[PDB]
Amino acid sequence: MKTQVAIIGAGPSGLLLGQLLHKAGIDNVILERQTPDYVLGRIRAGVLEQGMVDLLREAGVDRRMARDGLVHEGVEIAFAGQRRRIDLKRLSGGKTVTVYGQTEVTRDLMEAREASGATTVYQAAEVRLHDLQGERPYVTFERDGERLRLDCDYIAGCDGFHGISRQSIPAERLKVFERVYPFGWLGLLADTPPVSHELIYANHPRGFALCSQRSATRSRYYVQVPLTEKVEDWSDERFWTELKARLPAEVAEKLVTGPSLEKSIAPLTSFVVEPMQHGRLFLAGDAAHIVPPTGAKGLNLAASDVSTLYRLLLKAYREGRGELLERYSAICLRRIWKAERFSWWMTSVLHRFPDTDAFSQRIQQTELEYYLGSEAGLATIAENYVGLPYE
Amino acid sequence: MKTQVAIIGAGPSGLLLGQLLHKAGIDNVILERQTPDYVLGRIRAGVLEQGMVDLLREAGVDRRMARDGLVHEGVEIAFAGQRRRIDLKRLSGGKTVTVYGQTEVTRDLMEAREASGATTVYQAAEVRLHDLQGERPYVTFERDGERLRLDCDYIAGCDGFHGISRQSIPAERLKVFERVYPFGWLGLLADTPPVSHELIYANHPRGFALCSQRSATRSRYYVQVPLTEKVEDWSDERFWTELKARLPAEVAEKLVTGPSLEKSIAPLTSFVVEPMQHGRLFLAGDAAHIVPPTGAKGLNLAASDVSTLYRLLLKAYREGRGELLERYSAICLRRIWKAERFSWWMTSVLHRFPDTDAFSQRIQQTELEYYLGSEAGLATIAENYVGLPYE
Ligand SMILES: Cc1cc2nc3c(=O)[nH]c(=O)nc-3n(C[C@H](O)[C@H](O)[C@H](O)COP(=O)(O)OP(=O)(O)OC[C@H]3O[C@@H](n4cnc5c(N)ncnc54)[C@H](O)[C@@H]3O)c2cc1C
Numbered sequence: 001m002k003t004q005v006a007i008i009g010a011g012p013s014g015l016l017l018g019q020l021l022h023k024a025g026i027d028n029v030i031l032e033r034q035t036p037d038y039v040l041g042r043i044r045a046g047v048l049e050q051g052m053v054d055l056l057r058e059a060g061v062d063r064r065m066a067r068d069g070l071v072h073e074g075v076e077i078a079f080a081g082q083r084r085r086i087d088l089k090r091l092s093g094g095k096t097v098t099v100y101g102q103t104e105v106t107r108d109l110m111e112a113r114e115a116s117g118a119t120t121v122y123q124a125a126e127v128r129l130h131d132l133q134g135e136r137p138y139v140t141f142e143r144d145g146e147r148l149r150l151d152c153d154y155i156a157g158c159d160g161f162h163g164i165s166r167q168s169i170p171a172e173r174l175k176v177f178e179r180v181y182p183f184g185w186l187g188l189l190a191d192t193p194p195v196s197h198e199l200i201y202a203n204h205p206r207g208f209a210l211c212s213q214r215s216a217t218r219s220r221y222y223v224q225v226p227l228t229e230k231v232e233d234w235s236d237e238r239f240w241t242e243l244k245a246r247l248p249a250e251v252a253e254k255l256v257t258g259p260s261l262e263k264s265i266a267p268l269t270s271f272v273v274e275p276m277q278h279g280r281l282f283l284a285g286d287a288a289h290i291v292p293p294t295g296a297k298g299l300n301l302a303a304s305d306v307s308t309l310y311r312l313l314l315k316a317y318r319e320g321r322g323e324l325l326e327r328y329s330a331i332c333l334r335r336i337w338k339a340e341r342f343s344w345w346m347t348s349v350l351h352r353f354p355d356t357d358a359f360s361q362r363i364q365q366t367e368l369e370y371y372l373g374s375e376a377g378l379a380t381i382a383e384n385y386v387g388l389p390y391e
Numbered sequence: 392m393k394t395q396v397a398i399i400g401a402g403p404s405g406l407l408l409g410q411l412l413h414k415a416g417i418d419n420v421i422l423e424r425q426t427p428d429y430v431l432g433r434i435r436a437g438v439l440e441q442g443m444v445d446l447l448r449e450a451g452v453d454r455r456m457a458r459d460g461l462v463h464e465g466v467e468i469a470f471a472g473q474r475r476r477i478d479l480k481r482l483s484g485g486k487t488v489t490v491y492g493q494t495e496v497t498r499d500l501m502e503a504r505e506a507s508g509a510t511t512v513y514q515a516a517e518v519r520l521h522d523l524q525g526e527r528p529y530v531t532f533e534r535d536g537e538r539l540r541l542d543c544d545y546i547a548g549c550d551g552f553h554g555i556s557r558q559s560i561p562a563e564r565l566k567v568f569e570r571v572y573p574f575g576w577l578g579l580l581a582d583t584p585p586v587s588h589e590l591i592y593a594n595h596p597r598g599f600a601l602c603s604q605r606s607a608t609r610s611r612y613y614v615q616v617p618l619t620e621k622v623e624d625w626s627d628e629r630f631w632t633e634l635k636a637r638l639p640a641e642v643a644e645k646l647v648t649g650p651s652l653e654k655s656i657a658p659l660t661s662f663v664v665e666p667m668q669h670g671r672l673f674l675a676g677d678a679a680h681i682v683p684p685t686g687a688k689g690l691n692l693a694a695s696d697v698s699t700l701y702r703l704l705l706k707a708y709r710e711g712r713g714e715l716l717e718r719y720s721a722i723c724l725r726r727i728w729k730a731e732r733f734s735w736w737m738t739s740v741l742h743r744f745p746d747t748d749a750f751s752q753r754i755q756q757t758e759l760e761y762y763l764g765s766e767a768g769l770a771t772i773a774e775n776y777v778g779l780p781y782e
């Protein structure tokens with residue numbers, strides 16, 4: 001079989017890229033290792049930037065989002081017995097963020113792709129990339145025991161952190177920057193109304209806690225935990241008790257608890273690879289970088305990578321300007337490093353780090369007091385949170 | 392002998408406090424371990440905040456400063472082959488900083504004190520504090536072999552980092568926060584015109600460099616060096632060569648070099664003690680806290696401590712409101728921690744740290760790119776640099 005753009009991965013990056021290209025008349029095939037069900041089971045993201053919201057509209061998949069998404073104008077940070085609200089809207093110059101589950105976005109894209117008739121191969125096993133530096137690269141995979149070959153012009157590696165694409169680039173061509181945090185986030189999804197109409201990030205002596213939501217009757221909560229913890233050691237009962245201990249009293253008493261629909265631990269890490277391309281292979285999303293969830297940037301960076309790749313591919317196909325593709329990495333990395341810096345900052349001021357001396361603890365506390373008390377300080381948080389401009 | 396306020400230390404803190412109190416009619420005695428000459432030999436500070444400038448006027452010692460000081464409206468940061476100017480004036484809402492040597496400020500204060508006839512005892516050896524928690528504390532010292540006693544109501548410890556005052560407070564009453572940096576600043580004072588009309592802080596792969604000044608014909612330069620260095624290993628020739636290697640080409644070629652009037656190494660440290668008082672003893676300046684020189688806050692924090700102590704002492708004596716003195720520490724510490732956080736931030740983004748991984752190096756570079764490229768980011772630097780409001 002042959003196509004123009006082969007896409008490895010049917011997570012949000014691959015689906016979004018596939019939809020945008022399909023609409024512009026550029027044929028693409030998506031190869032996914034898992035089943036549609038497995039992909040739909042991943043909870044993940046809840047916060048979307050306006051740029052991503054606009055990209056969904058451009059891809060014509062925003063109906064359900066416009067109806068069901070919750071536009072947030074502010075966010076709250078609680079520390080040392082204080083609760084400070086950051087008016088994102090006022091401080092960023094009118095921008096806001098939208099709360100809409102990653103599961104929902106993925107479902108919308110999958111339904112749109114299914115309807116268009118564009119090619120998608122689930123359970124595509126043993127994907128291998130070939131002749132990346134040639135003019136005719138190809139992808140081989142197994143479907144029901146038989147090895148098939150897919151010829152194409154370009155390959156978009158949208159296969160996440162553990163994908164085959166980043167592994168297909170000669171190791172000596174890549175420079176990796178990585179940082180592993182000494183903690184993870186234990187998350188719990190409950191069919192209960194959220195404790196607040198806005199998100200609450202809490203810095204507490206026992207560790208970080210976050211009150212988020214999915215809708216008016218579905219909440220998502222997180223608590224920082226050591227990497228040595230096992231989810232089976234955390235009953236719903238223990239989670240609720242611990243969550244309450246980390247929140248302000250007035251917030252903790254209005255908390256409606258309930259059984260969990262989902263519970264899991266996500267370890268925190270930062271990861272960046274430079275460059276993000278090799279010959280005809282271009283990496284996008286988690287395949288090229290990981291950000292700790294504290295700043296809500298992961299999916300949102302996947303969106304800007306895809307927006308950039310789609311626009312460069314359009315010029316290559318429609319305008320015959322293939323030279324512009326060499327610029328992909330430089331353009332993406334500028335935004336990636338700034339989002340990484342913000343996600344790192346947020347993580348360092350909201351979490352409890354093991355083996356922290358007295359000086360560092362005081363500085364951490366003073367960072368919050370200063371940034372949340374100064375108009376200039378609040379503005380740096382707000383502009384980064386709503387998301388920096390796309391290039 | 393008897394006095395109202397005994398002041399330990401004739402550095403800028405003690406002299407400034409002594410002058411303000413004398414003018415308000417509150418008698419004070421200053422005890423200094425060294426000679427006037429030794430004190431005058433310390434180069435130190437070059438940058439003053441507006442609050443300190445205003446306090447000098449209030450103390451009636453601003454003539455020479457108003458004539459000789461240089462008002463700066465901006466400052467420059469050079470990194471990765473770029474030179475970025477921070478318009479302090481525009482970004483802070485009209486505030487600026489004044490460049491006037493600490494040696495000059497000290498000389499002005501010493502001449503003013505000498506003229507007023509207020510008591511100052513130089514070469515006051517073996518100073519000891521007594522009955523701090525009593526209603527009648529006293530100070531003993533030796534002058535020309537004979538031990539004298541000085542009775543007083545209050546004692547102001549303005550004796551710097553190695554003073555006797557902080558050592559006179561029961562160790563279990565104090566909580567110390569400290570951080571030692573793995574480098575020092577090798578400074579050089581030259582009788583040459585400065586390379587720029589504004590300061591240049593430079594982050595370079597070889598390490599930090601700073602281009603400062605004292606007047607139109609006297610410059611002060613610094614380069615970051617390991618703590619294992621000896622000033623005798625650094626000839627003027629080696630210093631100039633190294634300085635040039637760390638500055639942008641265009642700046643390095645306009646550099647007028649010359650023999651040094653003074654050369655010394657200052658190690659970098661952060662130090663805070665809580666509280667800053669014990670009974671009738673109140674600590675001010677370096678006796679209570681040390682900030683790395685990167686943010687130019689040391690002398691400037693000494694000024695706000697003194698301004699607060701003077702105003703509280705005025706109410707105690709003039710208005711009989713002695714209870715207000717219990718508030719000294721809380722008021723000072725709020726400003727101290729914010730200046731410490733800024734001095735720490737400045738130090739971490741401008742210096743080369745040993746054993747820094749690739750991720751940290753990129754984040755350091757991105758911090759500069761973001762803060763110097765965003766209006767909100769530039770404003771946080773500017774408002775902190777000109778100095779946060781006095782309480
Ligand atoms: C707890 C948590 C909270 C988060 N919160 C937020 C938030 O609020 N906002 C935000 O912006 N981000 C958030 N993120 C991040 C966001 O979820 C991710 O960045 C996003 O999933 C990345 O999308 P992707 O398509 O690049 O990769 P993925 O979602 O990992 O999808 C990659 C796909 O490729 C498939 N694949 C893998 N290997 C192969 C192969 N060899 N062959 C073929 N197919 C393969 C995989 O099965 C998968 O379907 C959060 C993440 C977590 C863990």
Ligand SMILES: Cc1cc2nc3c(=O)[nH]c(=O)nc-3n(C[C@H](O)[C@H](O)[C@H](O)COP(=O)(O)OP(=O)(O)OC[C@H]3O[C@@H](n4cnc5c(N)ncnc54)[C@H](O)[C@@H]3O)c2cc1C
Pocket residue numbers: 399400401402403404405422423424425430435436437438439493515518549550551552553554555576578657675676677678684687688689690691692693
């Ligand atoms: C390289 C460098 C650059 C700097 N640059 C700046 C700048 O640009 N701007 C800024 O704000 N700050 C700067 N600082 C800091 C500033 O110099 C100090 O914070 C300031 O000297 C503190 O004043 P002080 O009076 O509290 O203490 P000091 O200046 O140390 O004076 C204390 C006095 O007490 C005396 N004393 C000591 N022990 C006793 C005793 N036992 N009995 C009696 N007398 C005693 C000492 O001899 C001394 O005279 C810089 C510092 C350095 C090292």
